[PDB]
Motif scaffolding. Structure first.
Motif, PDB file in Angstrom:
ATOM      1  N   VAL A 285       0.828  -1.203   0.000  1.00 16.34           N
ATOM      2  CA  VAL A 285       0.000   0.000   0.000  1.00 16.34           C
ATOM      3  C   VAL A 285       0.863   1.254   0.000  1.00 16.34           C
ATOM      4  O   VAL A 285       0.514   2.254  -0.629  1.00 16.34           O
ATOM      5  CB  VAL A 285      -0.960  -0.020   1.206  1.00 16.34           C
ATOM      6  N   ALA A 286       1.996   1.212   0.704  1.00 11.52           N
ATOM      7  CA  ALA A 286       2.858   2.384   0.796  1.00 11.52           C
ATOM      8  C   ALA A 286       3.421   2.771  -0.564  1.00 11.52           C
ATOM      9  O   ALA A 286       3.523   3.960  -0.887  1.00 11.52           O
ATOM     10  CB  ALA A 286       3.990   2.118   1.788  1.00 11.52           C
ATOM     11  N   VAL A 287       3.794   1.782  -1.378  1.00 11.36           N
ATOM     12  CA  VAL A 287       4.424   2.088  -2.658  1.00 11.36           C
ATOM     13  C   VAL A 287       3.453   2.813  -3.581  1.00 11.36           C
ATOM     14  O   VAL A 287       3.851   3.727  -4.313  1.00 11.36           O
ATOM     15  CB  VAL A 287       4.963   0.799  -3.306  1.00 11.36           C
ATOM     16  N   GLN A 288       2.177   2.425  -3.574  1.00  9.01           N
ATOM     17  CA  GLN A 288       1.192   3.135  -4.382  1.00  9.01           C
ATOM     18  C   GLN A 288       0.997   4.558  -3.882  1.00  9.01           C
ATOM     19  O   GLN A 288       0.866   5.493  -4.681  1.00  9.01           O
ATOM     20  CB  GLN A 288      -0.137   2.384  -4.371  1.00  9.01           C
ATOM     21  N   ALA A 289       0.970   4.742  -2.561  1.00  7.27           N
ATOM     22  CA  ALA A 289       0.793   6.079  -2.007  1.00  7.27           C
ATOM     23  C   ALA A 289       1.972   6.981  -2.337  1.00  7.27           C
ATOM     24  O   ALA A 289       1.790   8.187  -2.540  1.00  7.27           O
ATOM     25  CB  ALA A 289       0.599   5.995  -0.494  1.00  7.27           C
ATOM     26  N   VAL A 290       3.183   6.425  -2.385  1.00 10.01           N
ATOM     27  CA  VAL A 290       4.357   7.229  -2.707  1.00 10.01           C
ATOM     28  C   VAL A 290       4.339   7.636  -4.175  1.00 10.01           C
ATOM     29  O   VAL A 290       4.634   8.788  -4.518  1.00 10.01           O
ATOM     30  CB  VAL A 290       5.638   6.458  -2.344  1.00 10.01           C
ATOM     31  N   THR A 291       3.999   6.703  -5.066  1.00 11.40           N
ATOM     32  CA  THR A 291       3.892   7.040  -6.481  1.00 11.40           C
ATOM     33  C   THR A 291       2.781   8.053  -6.715  1.00 11.40           C
ATOM     34  O   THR A 291       2.945   9.010  -7.482  1.00 11.40           O
ATOM     35  CB  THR A 291       3.640   5.775  -7.302  1.00 11.40           C
ATOM     36  N   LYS A 292       1.639   7.859  -6.055  1.00 13.75           N
ATOM     37  CA  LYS A 292       0.528   8.781  -6.235  1.00 13.75           C
ATOM     38  C   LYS A 292       0.877  10.142  -5.647  1.00 13.75           C
ATOM     39  O   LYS A 292       0.478  11.184  -6.178  1.00 13.75           O
ATOM     40  CB  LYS A 292      -0.728   8.209  -5.577  1.00 13.75           C
ATOM     41  N   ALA A 293       1.630  10.146  -4.542  1.00 14.05           N
ATOM     42  CA  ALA A 293       2.113  11.398  -3.969  1.00 14.05           C
ATOM     43  C   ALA A 293       3.040  12.122  -4.934  1.00 14.05           C
ATOM     44  O   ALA A 293       2.968  13.347  -5.074  1.00 14.05           O
ATOM     45  CB  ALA A 293       2.827  11.122  -2.646  1.00 14.05           C
ATOM     46  N   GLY A 294       3.928  11.383  -5.601  1.00 11.40           N
ATOM     47  CA  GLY A 294       4.772  11.999  -6.611  1.00 11.40           C
ATOM     48  C   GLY A 294       3.969  12.570  -7.764  1.00 11.40           C
ATOM     49  O   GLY A 294       4.278  13.648  -8.274  1.00 11.40           O
ATOM     50  N   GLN A 295       2.929  11.852  -8.189  1.00 10.55           N
ATOM     51  CA  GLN A 295       2.059  12.362  -9.247  1.00 10.55           C
ATOM     52  C   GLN A 295       1.384  13.659  -8.818  1.00 10.55           C
ATOM     53  O   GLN A 295       1.318  14.630  -9.587  1.00 10.55           O
ATOM     54  CB  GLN A 295       1.010  11.311  -9.606  1.00 10.55           C
ATOM     55  N   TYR A 296       0.871  13.691  -7.587  1.00  8.93           N
ATOM     56  CA  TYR A 296       0.235  14.904  -7.084  1.00  8.93           C
ATOM     57  C   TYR A 296       1.229  16.052  -7.001  1.00  8.93           C
ATOM     58  O   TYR A 296       0.894  17.192  -7.334  1.00  8.93           O
ATOM     59  CB  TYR A 296      -0.388  14.655  -5.712  1.00  8.93           C
ATOM     60  N   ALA A 297       2.449  15.777  -6.539  1.00 12.37           N
ATOM     61  CA  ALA A 297       3.460  16.827  -6.482  1.00 12.37           C
ATOM     62  C   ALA A 297       3.764  17.357  -7.875  1.00 12.37           C
ATOM     63  O   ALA A 297       3.863  18.574  -8.079  1.00 12.37           O
ATOM     64  CB  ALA A 297       4.731  16.298  -5.816  1.00 12.37           C
ATOM     65  N   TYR A 298       3.879  16.456  -8.852  1.00 16.48           N
ATOM     66  CA  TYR A 298       4.190  16.866 -10.216  1.00 16.48           C
ATOM     67  C   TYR A 298       3.088  17.756 -10.778  1.00 16.48           C
ATOM     68  O   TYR A 298       3.363  18.770 -11.429  1.00 16.48           O
ATOM     69  CB  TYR A 298       4.397  15.625 -11.088  1.00 16.48           C
ATOM     70  N   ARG A 299       1.824  17.388 -10.538  1.00 18.80           N
ATOM     71  CA  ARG A 299       0.712  18.185 -11.054  1.00 18.80           C
ATOM     72  C   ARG A 299       0.568  19.515 -10.316  1.00 18.80           C
ATOM     73  O   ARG A 299       0.308  20.555 -10.941  1.00 18.80           O
ATOM     74  CB  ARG A 299      -0.582  17.374 -10.968  1.00 18.80           C
ATOM     75  N   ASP A 300       0.748  19.522  -8.999  1.00 24.58           N
ATOM     76  CA  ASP A 300       0.592  20.756  -8.246  1.00 24.58           C
ATOM     77  C   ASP A 300       1.770  21.694  -8.419  1.00 24.58           C
ATOM     78  O   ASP A 300       1.640  22.881  -8.123  1.00 24.58           O
ATOM     79  CB  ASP A 300       0.389  20.464  -6.758  1.00 24.58           C
ATOM     80  N   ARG A 301       2.899  21.205  -8.924  1.00 27.57           N
ATOM     81  CA  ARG A 301       3.976  22.110  -9.293  1.00 27.57           C
ATOM     82  C   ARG A 301       3.575  22.992 -10.469  1.00 27.57           C
ATOM     83  O   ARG A 301       4.004  24.147 -10.556  1.00 27.57           O
ATOM     84  CB  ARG A 301       5.217  21.294  -9.618  1.00 27.57           C
ATOM     85  N   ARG A 302       2.768  22.456 -11.387  1.00 25.11           N
ATOM     86  CA  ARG A 302       2.133  23.271 -12.416  1.00 25.11           C
ATOM     87  C   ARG A 302       1.047  24.150 -11.810  1.00 25.11           C
ATOM     88  O   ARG A 302       0.968  25.348 -12.098  1.00 25.11           O
ATOM     89  CB  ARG A 302       1.520  22.369 -13.493  1.00 25.11           C
ATOM     90  N   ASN A 303       0.193  23.558 -10.969  1.00 24.30           N
ATOM     91  CA  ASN A 303      -0.995  24.260 -10.484  1.00 24.30           C
ATOM     92  C   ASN A 303      -0.685  25.401  -9.510  1.00 24.30           C
ATOM     93  O   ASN A 303      -1.501  26.325  -9.376  1.00 24.30           O
ATOM     94  CB  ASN A 303      -1.946  23.263  -9.824  1.00 24.30           C
ATOM     95  N   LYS A 304       0.459  25.360  -8.821  1.00 26.57           N
ATOM     96  CA  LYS A 304       0.749  26.369  -7.808  1.00 26.57           C
ATOM     97  C   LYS A 304       0.959  27.743  -8.427  1.00 26.57           C
ATOM     98  O   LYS A 304       0.555  28.755  -7.840  1.00 26.57           O
ATOM     99  CB  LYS A 304       1.976  25.944  -6.997  1.00 26.57           C
ATOM    100  N   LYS A 305       1.576  27.800  -9.606  1.00 20.47           N
ATOM    101  CA  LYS A 305       1.759  29.077 -10.284  1.00 20.47           C
ATOM    102  C   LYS A 305       0.420  29.704 -10.634  1.00 20.47           C
ATOM    103  O   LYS A 305       0.225  30.911 -10.441  1.00 20.47           O
ATOM    104  CB  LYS A 305       2.587  28.862 -11.547  1.00 20.47           C
ATOM    105  N   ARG A 306      -0.525  28.892 -11.111  1.00 23.42           N
ATOM    106  CA  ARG A 306      -1.852  29.401 -11.429  1.00 23.42           C
ATOM    107  C   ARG A 306      -2.551  29.889 -10.170  1.00 23.42           C
ATOM    108  O   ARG A 306      -3.168  30.958 -10.174  1.00 23.42           O
ATOM    109  CB  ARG A 306      -2.709  28.316 -12.085  1.00 23.42           C
ATOM    110  N   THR A 307      -2.457  29.118  -9.084  1.00 23.97           N
ATOM    111  CA  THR A 307      -3.124  29.508  -7.845  1.00 23.97           C
ATOM    112  C   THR A 307      -2.572  30.823  -7.310  1.00 23.97           C
ATOM    113  O   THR A 307      -3.330  31.692  -6.860  1.00 23.97           O
ATOM    114  CB  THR A 307      -2.977  28.401  -6.800  1.00 23.97           C
ATOM    115  N   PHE A 308      -1.252  30.996  -7.359  1.00 20.56           N
ATOM    116  CA  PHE A 308      -0.672  32.216  -6.818  1.00 20.56           C
ATOM    117  C   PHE A 308      -0.931  33.410  -7.726  1.00 20.56           C
ATOM    118  O   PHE A 308      -1.119  34.526  -7.229  1.00 20.56           O
ATOM    119  CB  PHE A 308       0.822  32.018  -6.571  1.00 20.56           C
TER     120      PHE A 308
END
Lengths: 116, 109, 99, 103, 48
Positions: A33-56
């Motif tokens: 379960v941890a390995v999926q959460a880490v990969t999904k966490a990386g995916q979320y980080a990758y997407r929110d690195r794009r999204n943070k500029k828009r939010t700010f």
RNA sequence: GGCUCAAACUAGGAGCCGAAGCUGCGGAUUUGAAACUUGUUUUCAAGUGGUAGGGGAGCGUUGUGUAAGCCUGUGAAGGU
RNA sequence: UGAAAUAGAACCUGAAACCGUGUGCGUACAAGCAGUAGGAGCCUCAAUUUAUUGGGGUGACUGCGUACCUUUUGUAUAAU
């Protein structure tokens, strides 16, 4: 020449469980379960690195709109007046000035309104 | 300062003994002994027995005044499980866990 | 044959080959060989020459890193491995004929 | 006293003696860099705004040191399509200290 | 003539062999290049 | 939600928002072109989503030589 | 006694699942793959001429966000 996988498997799994620290339930304890959460966490980080500029940019625009309306002007006209005045101050700096220095933003709005 | 008694290997489930332990955790030895001697649970005999062993240790091996002692901390751990076979209907078998527990009690001022 | 040739050439080029006129140990006795090696300043060496006498073999074998082989039965792993090489001119001539 | 300056495609509101972080600059340890393209200099009640720059205004900065950014893990993954990808990135940055602001 | 510690075969002399089914990163994972489930993806398959 | 000289529709006009598109700044890399020229250096141009699949470059583990070496009870392996 | 006794005979080391106890923060008006990008407060170490920064623990609140594999034209799939 037999190879035992114990040590390397232990270290591989510890890396993932270390990256999975702080997660709930099986996600921070068991590898499947941890390995999926880490990969999904990386995916979320990758997407929110794009999204943070828009939010700010969103937040800066909101604050600039608030300041301009306090000084008697809307955002779509204040930015147009900036662009006609050839003022290159970015929205981040404009929002900072609006939030922490009201008089300087008033001067900026005066320049924009004189250019309009 | 903490004097320890251990009762490794009780023939009872830790989950059952924990209910007894939670009620004596932190109390004075007199109140805990009273609770344990007027408790209606099998875990209470083991807990009282280990608490008495701890009190005797603190009074004999370390010369403490038992009048000011307290149950500083107590917890129950799972022991070794005896694995037995339970026959069921239609020739099917089930495994039975006869669980044991270890009782650790530490008394101090 | 070419690998042996290159090994010998590079041994000469890096000065790990030493030519001696002869090497005959008078009696089976390690210390005599050690004394000879002392003057030759080759504590560890591989010795190859026309023929191997029983006394020289018995002296050489005990020594940690000293080995003796006949010219015909010579291996590249040995030549490469052992740090210094002691070799006679007659053995050298027979290496020329062989290669 | 504060000023709005440009560096690395970004704009920064800065005061004297502030430690700022900017994109890697090819400038040696301890050298002085002068920027005359500042967009605004505010001295307090007096405000000056460039059109688009303020003439006669310069800002001097010094590079204390060059350091790599904190490691960042980058993960791409396509579910059911037999594709994963892992990378590590560090962003180069330079510290800047503003010795003085001139209007 | 060098040491046994420093002999090399030379560039291009040696190539590493392919090992099928050793993960995604190797480029041969899950199949070893056999494609998907047909006659040619089975164990005892040949090209008659 | 709520909206009726609309916050609906029609015909125009001017602003702004709006993506991982483009631009700005920093970094990596494939190919190609120039030259101290097998990464020795700097540049320029075009690229760098990817399943089946093809090509290239490596990491780690066990064992053999290197190794009668080197490390090691002033603490090896393993575990955390 | 032993160098060592969480080397005490279920005895070299002693991982993970799993189950306890203690300390720190959060949680009983709030709906969903449980994370991620921000982010107040609190606690704890270090500096610093003294509530300001740096490391660590938690995470009120806001945005986005329907696991993995397989097989498929196509899966969060209530297909395996």
């Amino acid at each position: 020449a037999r190879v035992k996988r114990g040590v390397q498997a232990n270290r591989r799994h510890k890396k993932i469980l270390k990256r999975a620290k702080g997660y709930y339930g099986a996600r921070s304890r068991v590898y499947r379960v941890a390995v999926q959460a880490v990969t999904k966490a990386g995916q979320y980080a990758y997407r929110d690195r794009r999204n943070k500029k828009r939010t700010f940019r969103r937040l800066w625009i909101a604050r600039i709109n608030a300041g301009a309306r306090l000084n008697g002007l809307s955002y779509s006209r204040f930015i147009n007046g900036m662009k006609k005045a050839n003022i290159t101050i970015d929205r981040r700096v404009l929002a900072d000035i609006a939030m922490h220095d009201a008089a300087t933003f008033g001067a900026l709005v005066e320049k924009a309104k004189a250019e309009l | 300062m903490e004097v320890t008694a251990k009762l490794r290997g009780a023939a009872i489930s830790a989950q059952k003994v924990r209910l007894v332990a939670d009620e004596v955790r932190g109390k004075s030895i007199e109140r805990a002994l009273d609770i344990l001697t007027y408790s209606n649970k099998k875990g209470a005999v083991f807990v009282k027995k280990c608490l008495n062993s701890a009190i005797a240790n603190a009074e004999h091996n370390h010369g403490l005044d038992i009048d000011g002692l307290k149950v500083a901390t107590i917890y129950v751990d799972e022991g070794i499980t005896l694995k037995r076979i339970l026959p069921r209907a239609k020739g099917r078998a089930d495994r039975i866990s006869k669980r044991t527990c270890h009782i650790t009690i530490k008394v101090g001022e | 044959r070419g690998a042996m040739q290159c090994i010998l050439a590079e041994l000469i080029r890096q000065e790990r080959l030493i030519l001696v006129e002869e090497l005959t140990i008078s009696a089976p006795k390690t210390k005599e060989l050690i004394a000879k090696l002392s003057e030759l300043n080759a504590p560890r060496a591989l010795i190859i020459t026309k023929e191997v006498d029983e006394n020289l073999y018995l002296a050489a074998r005990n020594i940690p890193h000293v080995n003796v082989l006949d010219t015909s039965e010579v291996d590249p792993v040995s030549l490469i491995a052992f740090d210094k090489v002691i070799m006679s001119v007659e053995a050298a001539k027979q290496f020329e004929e062989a290669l | 006293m504060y000023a709005v300056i440009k560096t690395g495609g970004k704009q920064h509101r800065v005061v004297v003696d502030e430690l700022l972080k900017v994109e890697l600059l090819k400038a040696e340890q301890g050298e002085t860099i002068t920027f005359n393209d500042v967009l605004m200099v505010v001295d307090g009640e007096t405000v000056k705004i460039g059109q688009p720059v303020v003439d006669g205004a310069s800002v001097e900065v010094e590079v204390i040191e060059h350091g790599r950014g904190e490691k960042i893990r980058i993960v791409k993954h396509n579910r059911r399509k037999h594709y994963h990808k892992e990378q590590g990135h560090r962003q180069w940055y330079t510290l800047l200290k503003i010795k003085a602001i001139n209007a | 003539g060098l040491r046994l510690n420093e002999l090399s075969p030379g560039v291009g002399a040696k190539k590493t062999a392919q090992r099928r089914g050793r993960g995604i990163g190797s480029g041969l994972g899950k199949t070893g290049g056999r494609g998907v489930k047909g006659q040619k993806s089975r164990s005892g398959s040949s090209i008659r």
